[PDB]
PDB file of C-alpha atoms in Angstrom:
ATOM      1  CA  UNK A   1      20.445   7.532  -4.478  1.00 39.09           C
ATOM      2  CA  UNK A   2      18.179   9.996  -7.273  1.00 39.83           C
ATOM      3  CA  UNK A   3      16.417  12.763  -6.185  1.00 41.65           C
ATOM      4  CA  UNK A   4      13.980  15.087  -8.064  1.00 40.39           C
ATOM      5  CA  UNK A   5      13.381  18.805  -6.673  1.00 36.57           C
ATOM      6  CA  UNK A   6       9.743  19.847  -6.240  1.00 34.81           C
ATOM      7  CA  UNK A   7       8.232  23.418  -7.877  1.00 34.31           C
ATOM      8  CA  UNK A   8       8.648  24.604  -3.911  1.00 35.40           C
ATOM      9  CA  UNK A   9      12.130  23.118  -4.020  1.00 36.31           C
ATOM     10  CA  UNK A  10      12.993  19.841  -1.463  1.00 34.39           C
ATOM     11  CA  UNK A  11      13.724  17.206  -3.008  1.00 35.32           C
ATOM     12  CA  UNK A  12      12.626  13.868  -3.784  1.00 36.96           C
ATOM     13  CA  UNK A  13      13.423  10.667  -4.013  1.00 35.86           C
ATOM     14  CA  UNK A  14      13.252   8.813  -7.417  1.00 32.86           C
ATOM     15  CA  UNK A  15      12.452   5.306  -6.117  1.00 31.16           C
ATOM     16  CA  UNK A  16       9.551   4.473  -3.818  1.00 35.71           C
ATOM     17  CA  UNK A  17       8.227   1.624  -1.382  1.00 33.54           C
ATOM     18  CA  UNK A  18       4.381   2.380  -0.793  1.00 32.74           C
ATOM     19  CA  UNK A  19       2.099   0.015   1.569  1.00 32.47           C
ATOM     20  CA  UNK A  20      -1.414  -1.231   1.170  1.00 32.82           C
ATOM     21  CA  UNK A  21      -4.202  -2.010   2.730  1.00 27.71           C
ATOM     22  CA  UNK A  22      -3.974  -6.028   4.057  1.00 27.18           C
ATOM     23  CA  UNK A  23      -5.135  -7.764   6.858  1.00 25.76           C
ATOM     24  CA  UNK A  24      -1.949  -8.235   8.748  1.00 25.82           C
ATOM     25  CA  UNK A  25      -0.525  -5.311  10.580  1.00 22.16           C
ATOM     26  CA  UNK A  26       2.796  -7.308  11.674  1.00 22.88           C
ATOM     27  CA  UNK A  27       3.549  -8.057   7.491  1.00 20.22           C
ATOM     28  CA  UNK A  28       2.420  -4.553   6.974  1.00 18.51           C
ATOM     29  CA  UNK A  29       5.012  -2.988   9.871  1.00 16.93           C
ATOM     30  CA  UNK A  30       7.957  -5.820   9.058  1.00 17.21           C
ATOM     31  CA  UNK A  31       7.569  -4.318   4.723  1.00 17.39           C
ATOM     32  CA  UNK A  32       8.553  -0.866   6.385  1.00 19.56           C
ATOM     33  CA  UNK A  33      11.188  -1.585   8.532  1.00 19.83           C
ATOM     34  CA  UNK A  34      13.256  -4.504   5.921  1.00 20.95           C
ATOM     35  CA  UNK A  35      12.131  -2.081   3.340  1.00 21.10           C
ATOM     36  CA  UNK A  36      13.865   1.184   4.536  1.00 20.53           C
ATOM     37  CA  UNK A  37      17.159  -1.403   5.636  1.00 17.72           C
ATOM     38  CA  UNK A  38      16.754  -2.418   1.831  1.00 17.48           C
ATOM     39  CA  UNK A  39      17.358   1.659   0.733  1.00 18.49           C
ATOM     40  CA  UNK A  40      14.087   2.908   0.598  1.00 16.20           C
ATOM     41  CA  UNK A  41      14.094   6.460   2.422  1.00 12.90           C
ATOM     42  CA  UNK A  42      10.896   8.327   0.247  1.00 15.45           C
ATOM     43  CA  UNK A  43       7.883   5.530   1.541  1.00 14.25           C
ATOM     44  CA  UNK A  44       3.647   5.873   1.032  1.00 13.26           C
ATOM     45  CA  UNK A  45       0.954   5.172   2.560  1.00  9.07           C
ATOM     46  CA  UNK A  46      -2.672   6.724   2.784  1.00  7.07           C
ATOM     47  CA  UNK A  47      -5.029   7.044   5.713  1.00  8.00           C
ATOM     48  CA  UNK A  48      -7.797   5.296   3.101  1.00  7.92           C
ATOM     49  CA  UNK A  49      -5.464   1.455   3.901  1.00  5.42           C
ATOM     50  CA  UNK A  50      -5.635   2.173   7.238  1.00  9.99           C
ATOM     51  CA  UNK A  51      -2.128   1.323   8.274  1.00 11.04           C
ATOM     52  CA  UNK A  52      -1.222   4.417   9.090  1.00  9.29           C
ATOM     53  CA  UNK A  53      -0.486   3.235  13.127  1.00 10.03           C
ATOM     54  CA  UNK A  54       2.161   0.398  11.260  1.00  9.70           C
ATOM     55  CA  UNK A  55       3.682   2.500   8.896  1.00 10.74           C
ATOM     56  CA  UNK A  56       5.102   4.979  12.357  1.00 10.28           C
ATOM     57  CA  UNK A  57       5.433   2.441  14.511  1.00  9.09           C
ATOM     58  CA  UNK A  58       8.202   1.260  11.738  1.00  7.93           C
ATOM     59  CA  UNK A  59       9.783   4.536  11.848  1.00  7.17           C
ATOM     60  CA  UNK A  60       9.689   4.671  14.530  1.00  9.63           C
ATOM     61  CA  UNK A  61      12.042   0.462  14.806  1.00 10.98           C
ATOM     62  CA  UNK A  62      13.804   1.578  11.574  1.00  9.40           C
ATOM     63  CA  UNK A  63      16.467   3.482  13.235  1.00  9.86           C
ATOM     64  CA  UNK A  64      16.641   5.467  10.685  1.00 11.13           C
ATOM     65  CA  UNK A  65      16.162  10.074  11.080  1.00  8.67           C
ATOM     66  CA  UNK A  66      13.015  11.590  10.429  1.00  5.16           C
ATOM     67  CA  UNK A  67      15.383  13.750   8.573  1.00  5.88           C
ATOM     68  CA  UNK A  68      16.163  11.578   6.628  1.00  6.36           C
ATOM     69  CA  UNK A  69      12.962   9.760   6.272  1.00  5.26           C
ATOM     70  CA  UNK A  70      10.572  11.362   3.481  1.00  8.21           C
ATOM     71  CA  UNK A  71       6.641  10.685   4.062  1.00  8.80           C
ATOM     72  CA  UNK A  72       3.887  10.476   2.145  1.00 10.31           C
ATOM     73  CA  UNK A  73      -0.104   9.884   3.255  1.00 11.28           C
ATOM     74  CA  UNK A  74      -3.641  11.250   2.144  1.00 10.07           C
ATOM     75  CA  UNK A  75      -6.318  12.793   2.799  1.00 10.35           C
ATOM     76  CA  UNK A  76      -9.379  10.160   2.504  1.00  8.73           C
ATOM     77  CA  UNK A  77     -12.451  12.270   1.025  1.00  8.00           C
ATOM     78  CA  UNK A  78     -14.832  11.734   4.173  1.00  8.71           C
ATOM     79  CA  UNK A  79     -13.277  14.561   4.798  1.00  7.75           C
ATOM     80  CA  UNK A  80     -12.865  16.295   1.087  1.00 11.15           C
ATOM     81  CA  UNK A  81     -13.218  19.569   2.210  1.00 13.09           C
ATOM     82  CA  UNK A  82     -12.369  22.716   4.543  1.00 11.52           C
ATOM     83  CA  UNK A  83     -12.302  21.001   8.420  1.00  9.58           C
ATOM     84  CA  UNK A  84     -13.556  17.953   7.542  1.00  9.53           C
ATOM     85  CA  UNK A  85      -8.609  18.529   5.659  1.00 10.54           C
ATOM     86  CA  UNK A  86      -7.321  19.581   8.751  1.00  9.31           C
ATOM     87  CA  UNK A  87      -9.096  17.918  11.134  1.00 11.16           C
ATOM     88  CA  UNK A  88      -8.005  13.844   9.279  1.00 11.88           C
ATOM     89  CA  UNK A  89      -4.984  15.427   8.619  1.00 11.48           C
ATOM     90  CA  UNK A  90      -3.970  15.419  12.566  1.00 12.62           C
ATOM     91  CA  UNK A  91      -5.527  11.855  12.886  1.00  7.47           C
ATOM     92  CA  UNK A  92      -2.977  10.889  10.154  1.00  7.90           C
ATOM     93  CA  UNK A  93       0.421  12.560  12.012  1.00  6.21           C
ATOM     94  CA  UNK A  94      -1.160  11.336  14.997  1.00  4.72           C
ATOM     95  CA  UNK A  95      -0.963   7.161  13.879  1.00  2.96           C
ATOM     96  CA  UNK A  96       2.220   8.100  11.884  1.00  2.00           C
ATOM     97  CA  UNK A  97       3.830   9.331  14.854  1.00  2.00           C
ATOM     98  CA  UNK A  98       5.081  12.528  12.794  1.00  2.00           C
ATOM     99  CA  UNK A  99       5.717  16.522  14.148  1.00  2.00           C
ATOM    100  CA  UNK A 100       5.565  17.083  10.040  1.00  2.00           C
ATOM    101  CA  UNK A 101       4.723  14.975   6.820  1.00  2.00           C
ATOM    102  CA  UNK A 102       7.061  15.789   4.010  1.00  2.00           C
ATOM    103  CA  UNK A 103       3.648  15.139   1.583  1.00  2.00           C
ATOM    104  CA  UNK A 104      -0.121  15.141   1.832  1.00  2.00           C
ATOM    105  CA  UNK A 105      -1.702  14.844  -1.533  1.00  2.00           C
ATOM    106  CA  UNK A 106      -6.037  14.904  -1.601  1.00  2.86           C
ATOM    107  CA  UNK A 107      -5.929  10.807  -2.472  1.00  2.00           C
ATOM    108  CA  UNK A 108      -8.943  10.800  -4.779  1.00  2.08           C
ATOM    109  CA  UNK A 109     -10.388  13.330  -7.193  1.00  2.00           C
ATOM    110  CA  UNK A 110     -14.226  13.608  -5.590  1.00  2.00           C
ATOM    111  CA  UNK A 111     -15.761  15.811  -2.917  1.00  2.00           C
ATOM    112  CA  UNK A 112     -14.979  19.031  -1.600  1.00  2.00           C
ATOM    113  CA  UNK A 113     -11.409  19.710  -3.739  1.00  2.00           C
ATOM    114  CA  UNK A 114     -11.138  23.514  -3.185  1.00  2.00           C
ATOM    115  CA  UNK A 115     -11.456  23.731   0.683  1.00  2.00           C
ATOM    116  CA  UNK A 116      -9.675  20.835   1.394  1.00  2.00           C
ATOM    117  CA  UNK A 117      -6.915  22.661  -0.496  1.00  2.00           C
ATOM    118  CA  UNK A 118      -7.575  25.746   1.005  1.00  2.00           C
ATOM    119  CA  UNK A 119      -6.696  24.003   4.497  1.00  2.00           C
ATOM    120  CA  UNK A 120      -3.751  21.848   3.674  1.00  2.00           C
ATOM    121  CA  UNK A 121      -2.692  25.592   1.824  1.00  2.00           C
ATOM    122  CA  UNK A 122      -2.697  26.084   5.470  1.00  2.00           C
ATOM    123  CA  UNK A 123      -1.214  23.438   7.139  1.00  2.38           C
ATOM    124  CA  UNK A 124       2.085  23.682   4.522  1.00  5.27           C
ATOM    125  CA  UNK A 125       2.697  27.230   5.688  1.00  6.22           C
ATOM    126  CA  UNK A 126       1.977  26.370   9.988  1.00  8.54           C
ATOM    127  CA  UNK A 127       4.150  24.104   8.401  1.00  8.69           C
ATOM    128  CA  UNK A 128       3.042  20.567   8.987  1.00  8.03           C
ATOM    129  CA  UNK A 129       3.728  19.792   5.269  1.00  6.48           C
ATOM    130  CA  UNK A 130       6.923  19.994   3.136  1.00  7.71           C
ATOM    131  CA  UNK A 131       4.874  20.402   0.089  1.00  8.79           C
ATOM    132  CA  UNK A 132       1.085  19.342  -0.912  1.00  9.19           C
ATOM    133  CA  UNK A 133      -0.179  17.233  -3.824  1.00  7.28           C
ATOM    134  CA  UNK A 134      -2.915  15.176  -5.544  1.00  7.12           C
ATOM    135  CA  UNK A 135      -3.203  11.909  -6.607  1.00  4.68           C
ATOM    136  CA  UNK A 136      -5.817  10.380 -10.325  1.00  3.95           C
ATOM    137  CA  UNK A 137      -5.951  13.763 -10.804  1.00  6.10           C
ATOM    138  CA  UNK A 138      -6.664  13.877 -15.161  1.00  2.46           C
ATOM    139  CA  UNK A 139      -5.435  16.953 -16.726  1.00  3.22           C
ATOM    140  CA  UNK A 140      -8.621  18.841 -16.051  1.00  2.00           C
ATOM    141  CA  UNK A 141      -8.689  18.904 -12.706  1.00  2.00           C
ATOM    142  CA  UNK A 142      -4.711  19.630 -11.705  1.00  3.24           C
ATOM    143  CA  UNK A 143      -5.463  22.739 -14.375  1.00  2.85           C
ATOM    144  CA  UNK A 144      -8.659  23.323 -12.397  1.00  6.08           C
ATOM    145  CA  UNK A 145      -6.913  23.797  -8.963  1.00  3.26           C
ATOM    146  CA  UNK A 146      -4.802  25.221 -10.642  1.00  2.00           C
ATOM    147  CA  UNK A 147      -6.879  27.815 -12.407  1.00  2.00           C
ATOM    148  CA  UNK A 148      -8.266  29.142  -8.273  1.00  2.00           C
ATOM    149  CA  UNK A 149      -5.712  28.458  -5.885  1.00  2.00           C
ATOM    150  CA  UNK A 150      -2.241  29.570  -4.673  1.00  2.82           C
ATOM    151  CA  UNK A 151      -0.514  26.899  -4.381  1.00  2.00           C
ATOM    152  CA  UNK A 152      -0.192  24.610  -7.488  1.00  2.00           C
ATOM    153  CA  UNK A 153       0.060  21.062  -6.328  1.00  2.00           C
ATOM    154  CA  UNK A 154       3.538  19.284  -6.045  1.00  2.00           C
ATOM    155  CA  UNK A 155       2.787  15.749  -7.006  1.00  2.56           C
ATOM    156  CA  UNK A 156       0.073  14.260  -8.845  1.00  2.00           C
ATOM    157  CA  UNK A 157       0.128  10.261  -8.251  1.00  2.00           C
ATOM    158  CA  UNK A 158      -1.395   8.448 -11.058  1.00  2.00           C
ATOM    159  CA  UNK A 159      -1.604   4.357 -12.211  1.00  3.95           C
ATOM    160  CA  UNK A 160       1.468   4.267 -14.171  1.00  3.22           C
ATOM    161  CA  UNK A 161       2.317   0.787 -16.364  1.00  2.18           C
ATOM    162  CA  UNK A 162       3.756  -0.824 -19.241  1.00  4.44           C
ATOM    163  CA  UNK A 163      -0.727  -1.002 -20.317  1.00  7.84           C
ATOM    164  CA  UNK A 164      -1.380   2.720 -19.191  1.00  9.08           C
ATOM    165  CA  UNK A 165       0.846   4.962 -19.686  1.00  6.63           C
ATOM    166  CA  UNK A 166      -0.364   8.526 -19.948  1.00  4.33           C
ATOM    167  CA  UNK A 167       1.347   9.346 -22.826  1.00  4.43           C
ATOM    168  CA  UNK A 168       0.158  12.697 -22.973  1.00  3.19           C
ATOM    169  CA  UNK A 169      -0.045  13.681 -19.008  1.00  2.21           C
ATOM    170  CA  UNK A 170       2.932  13.222 -17.650  1.00  3.02           C
ATOM    171  CA  UNK A 171       4.151  15.697 -20.114  1.00  8.01           C
ATOM    172  CA  UNK A 172       1.121  17.634 -19.587  1.00  6.84           C
ATOM    173  CA  UNK A 173       1.732  17.517 -16.518  1.00  4.96           C
ATOM    174  CA  UNK A 174       5.950  18.200 -17.003  1.00  6.08           C
ATOM    175  CA  UNK A 175       5.685  20.794 -18.813  1.00  4.95           C
ATOM    176  CA  UNK A 176       2.782  22.285 -15.737  1.00  6.00           C
ATOM    177  CA  UNK A 177       5.958  22.067 -12.880  1.00  4.89           C
ATOM    178  CA  UNK A 178       3.922  18.910 -11.391  1.00  4.70           C
ATOM    179  CA  UNK A 179       6.015  16.340 -10.100  1.00  4.29           C
ATOM    180  CA  UNK A 180       4.046  12.665 -11.442  1.00  5.35           C
ATOM    181  CA  UNK A 181       4.619   9.713  -9.353  1.00  3.12           C
ATOM    182  CA  UNK A 182       3.656   5.801 -10.391  1.00  2.00           C
ATOM    183  CA  UNK A 183       1.294   3.629  -8.591  1.00  2.00           C
ATOM    184  CA  UNK A 184       0.737   0.296  -9.987  1.00  2.00           C
ATOM    185  CA  UNK A 185       3.660   0.155 -12.214  1.00  2.00           C
ATOM    186  CA  UNK A 186       2.897  -3.298 -12.603  1.00  2.00           C
ATOM    187  CA  UNK A 187      -0.169  -2.790 -13.327  1.00  2.00           C
ATOM    188  CA  UNK A 188      -0.018  -5.791 -10.221  1.00  2.00           C
ATOM    189  CA  UNK A 189       0.160  -8.493 -12.386  1.00  2.00           C
ATOM    190  CA  UNK A 190      -2.565  -8.448 -13.720  1.00  2.00           C
ATOM    191  CA  UNK A 191      -3.016  -8.585 -18.423  1.00  2.00           C
ATOM    192  CA  UNK A 192       0.571 -11.221 -17.984  1.00  2.00           C
ATOM    193  CA  UNK A 193       2.689  -8.677 -17.663  1.00  2.00           C
ATOM    194  CA  UNK A 194       5.650 -10.380 -16.189  1.00  2.00           C
ATOM    195  CA  UNK A 195       5.278 -12.715 -19.107  1.00  2.00           C
ATOM    196  CA  UNK A 196       5.157 -10.240 -21.703  1.00  2.00           C
ATOM    197  CA  UNK A 197       7.743 -11.342 -24.113  1.00  2.95           C
ATOM    198  CA  UNK A 198       8.462  -7.586 -24.900  1.00  2.00           C
ATOM    199  CA  UNK A 199      10.179  -6.689 -21.512  1.00  2.00           C
ATOM    200  CA  UNK A 200      11.044 -10.224 -20.953  1.00  2.00           C
ATOM    201  CA  UNK A 201      13.533  -9.510 -23.498  1.00  2.00           C
ATOM    202  CA  UNK A 202      14.966  -6.425 -23.191  1.00  2.00           C
ATOM    203  CA  UNK A 203      15.357  -7.490 -19.568  1.00  2.00           C
ATOM    204  CA  UNK A 204      17.309 -10.717 -20.820  1.00  2.00           C
ATOM    205  CA  UNK A 205      19.972  -7.884 -22.974  1.00  2.00           C
ATOM    206  CA  UNK A 206      20.326  -6.936 -19.108  1.00  2.00           C
ATOM    207  CA  UNK A 207      20.428  -9.912 -16.754  1.00  2.00           C
ATOM    208  CA  UNK A 208      17.654  -7.287 -15.377  1.00  2.00           C
ATOM    209  CA  UNK A 209      14.351  -8.705 -14.549  1.00  2.00           C
ATOM    210  CA  UNK A 210      10.018  -7.970 -16.153  1.00  2.00           C
ATOM    211  CA  UNK A 211       9.920  -6.084 -13.101  1.00  2.00           C
ATOM    212  CA  UNK A 212      13.781  -3.530 -13.040  1.00  2.00           C
ATOM    213  CA  UNK A 213      13.278  -2.658 -17.326  1.00  2.00           C
ATOM    214  CA  UNK A 214       9.913  -1.631 -15.988  1.00  2.00           C
ATOM    215  CA  UNK A 215      11.150   0.521 -13.183  1.00  2.00           C
ATOM    216  CA  UNK A 216      13.613   1.569 -14.943  1.00  2.00           C
ATOM    217  CA  UNK A 217      11.107   2.417 -17.176  1.00  2.00           C
ATOM    218  CA  UNK A 218       9.664   4.785 -15.655  1.00  2.00           C
ATOM    219  CA  UNK A 219      12.815   6.181 -13.817  1.00  2.00           C
ATOM    220  CA  UNK A 220      13.925   7.450 -17.417  1.00  2.00           C
ATOM    221  CA  UNK A 221      10.943   9.157 -18.092  1.00  2.00           C
ATOM    222  CA  UNK A 222      11.417  11.489 -14.817  1.00  2.00           C
ATOM    223  CA  UNK A 223       8.770   9.724 -13.038  1.00  2.00           C
ATOM    224  CA  UNK A 224       8.831   9.010  -9.303  1.00  2.00           C
ATOM    225  CA  UNK A 225       7.602   5.183  -8.743  1.00  2.00           C
ATOM    226  CA  UNK A 226       5.728   3.010  -6.068  1.00  4.80           C
ATOM    227  CA  UNK A 227       6.958  -0.799  -5.716  1.00  5.75           C
ATOM    228  CA  UNK A 228       5.887  -2.612  -3.132  1.00  4.62           C
ATOM    229  CA  UNK A 229       6.931  -6.416  -2.304  1.00  5.71           C
ATOM    230  CA  UNK A 230       6.277  -8.385   1.320  1.00  5.49           C
ATOM    231  CA  UNK A 231       9.072 -10.103   0.814  1.00  5.37           C
ATOM    232  CA  UNK A 232      12.178  -8.374   1.180  1.00  6.07           C
ATOM    233  CA  UNK A 233      14.281  -9.844  -2.030  1.00  2.51           C
ATOM    234  CA  UNK A 234      11.986  -8.682  -3.928  1.00  2.00           C
ATOM    235  CA  UNK A 235      12.850  -5.216  -2.197  1.00  5.30           C
ATOM    236  CA  UNK A 236      15.960  -5.670  -2.705  1.00  4.42           C
ATOM    237  CA  UNK A 237      15.522  -6.589  -6.732  1.00  6.10           C
ATOM    238  CA  UNK A 238      13.173  -3.855  -7.635  1.00  5.55           C
ATOM    239  CA  UNK A 239      15.332  -1.088  -5.890  1.00  6.70           C
ATOM    240  CA  UNK A 240      18.617  -2.377  -7.677  1.00  9.29           C
ATOM    241  CA  UNK A 241      17.940  -0.181 -11.536  1.00  8.89           C
ATOM    242  CA  UNK A 242      20.391   2.604 -10.543  1.00  8.36           C
ATOM    243  CA  UNK A 243      23.194  -0.005 -12.435  1.00  5.68           C
ATOM    244  CA  UNK A 244      21.864  -0.263 -16.206  1.00  6.78           C
ATOM    245  CA  UNK A 245      20.174   1.823 -18.202  1.00  6.85           C
ATOM    246  CA  UNK A 246      17.320   1.042 -21.466  1.00  6.34           C
ATOM    247  CA  UNK A 247      18.649   2.807 -25.272  1.00  6.48           C
ATOM    248  CA  UNK A 248      16.222   4.703 -27.183  1.00  8.29           C
ATOM    249  CA  UNK A 249      15.443   1.446 -29.207  1.00  5.16           C
ATOM    250  CA  UNK A 250      14.103  -0.333 -25.637  1.00  7.09           C
ATOM    251  CA  UNK A 251      12.015   2.559 -25.146  1.00  6.42           C
ATOM    252  CA  UNK A 252      10.912   3.134 -28.114  1.00  7.89           C
ATOM    253  CA  UNK A 253       9.531  -1.045 -27.867  1.00  6.29           C
ATOM    254  CA  UNK A 254       7.819  -0.608 -24.532  1.00  7.12           C
ATOM    255  CA  UNK A 255       5.618   2.599 -25.872  1.00  6.64           C
ATOM    256  CA  UNK A 256       4.558   0.442 -28.290  1.00 10.40           C
ATOM    257  CA  UNK A 257       2.908  -1.507 -25.794  1.00 10.32           C
ATOM    258  CA  UNK A 258       0.727   1.313 -24.224  1.00  7.10           C
ATOM    259  CA  UNK A 259      -3.197   0.901 -24.526  1.00  7.49           C
ATOM    260  CA  UNK A 260      -3.893   4.141 -22.124  1.00  4.06           C
ATOM    261  CA  UNK A 261      -6.376   2.207 -20.566  1.00  3.03           C
ATOM    262  CA  UNK A 262      -6.690   1.050 -16.510  1.00  2.00           C
ATOM    263  CA  UNK A 263      -6.112  -1.949 -15.357  1.00  2.00           C
ATOM    264  CA  UNK A 264      -8.407  -1.295 -12.300  1.00  2.00           C
ATOM    265  CA  UNK A 265     -11.284   1.698 -13.424  1.00  2.00           C
ATOM    266  CA  UNK A 266     -12.040   4.500 -14.411  1.00  3.60           C
ATOM    267  CA  UNK A 267     -12.343   7.370 -11.902  1.00  9.41           C
ATOM    268  CA  UNK A 268     -14.389   8.772 -14.937  1.00  4.78           C
ATOM    269  CA  UNK A 269     -16.876   5.795 -14.333  1.00  5.64           C
ATOM    270  CA  UNK A 270     -19.811   7.593 -11.914  1.00  4.09           C
ATOM    271  CA  UNK A 271     -20.478   4.611 -10.889  1.00  4.60           C
ATOM    272  CA  UNK A 272     -16.516   3.951 -10.349  1.00  5.15           C
ATOM    273  CA  UNK A 273     -17.727   7.742  -8.036  1.00  4.09           C
ATOM    274  CA  UNK A 274     -20.287   6.094  -6.538  1.00  2.66           C
ATOM    275  CA  UNK A 275     -19.303   3.416  -4.845  1.00  2.00           C
ATOM    276  CA  UNK A 276     -15.964   5.500  -3.995  1.00  2.00           C
ATOM    277  CA  UNK A 277     -17.762   7.943  -2.277  1.00  2.00           C
ATOM    278  CA  UNK A 278     -19.972   5.679  -0.949  1.00  2.00           C
ATOM    279  CA  UNK A 279     -17.301   3.756   1.788  1.00  2.00           C
ATOM    280  CA  UNK A 280     -17.104   4.520   5.229  1.00  2.00           C
ATOM    281  CA  UNK A 281     -13.813   4.202   7.051  1.00  2.00           C
ATOM    282  CA  UNK A 282     -13.014   4.809  10.933  1.00  2.00           C
ATOM    283  CA  UNK A 283     -10.106   7.279  10.043  1.00  2.00           C
TER     284      UNK A 283
END
């Protein structure tokens, strides 16, 4: 499939599969097996999803060699500081049953981010992490982290969908050599995205679904995407986007949908800071 080269030279797939918090462990593990069988090699989890053990089990069941898989996980904020980042990272490796991860991200822009980053630089230099990055950082926070540290984040994973398009933040990242990676590309169906008349009409041009149109739009902007489903047939649809292309006119009509509004919440809202930093997880 198609990859992009990160700023440290490593290749990352452009199409990935993300897991999320799930009531049932079995469904999570079977989904990752199905995603690998479907052709996904980039697999994304996080310590806070509390499913790393299931993800690790699924990799063992997949029959695919370790060196062909690109595994991402993320540090949860109760350990965003120097000693904590190393402790939780080792817990994550143990749960995942891995000796290294391909990409490790700070999950949220909260806590002692600089201390956690220094730890992550050391873990990378120890050969335990192929690339380090962050998630949900605005450009100000990225510029701050770069100004004071040695390694520039390889990836910043942020919400990208047709109502929250990151029209400036994506070019700002790319201009600094940071690879954007999209989560919630479908805005979890919020605001009637699946029935949106513009996206539907573009899809009918190519015999593609709204979801395929959206993932193709993300791809054409040079952004890595994470798509989730627990149904194998949807996974097969989501990955099958390398056989068509959106025109300039199509891309224009999609850009016009932007409201620069998260489907979820703002990471700059102090109530969301207060809420997330108060969560206590056994990870």
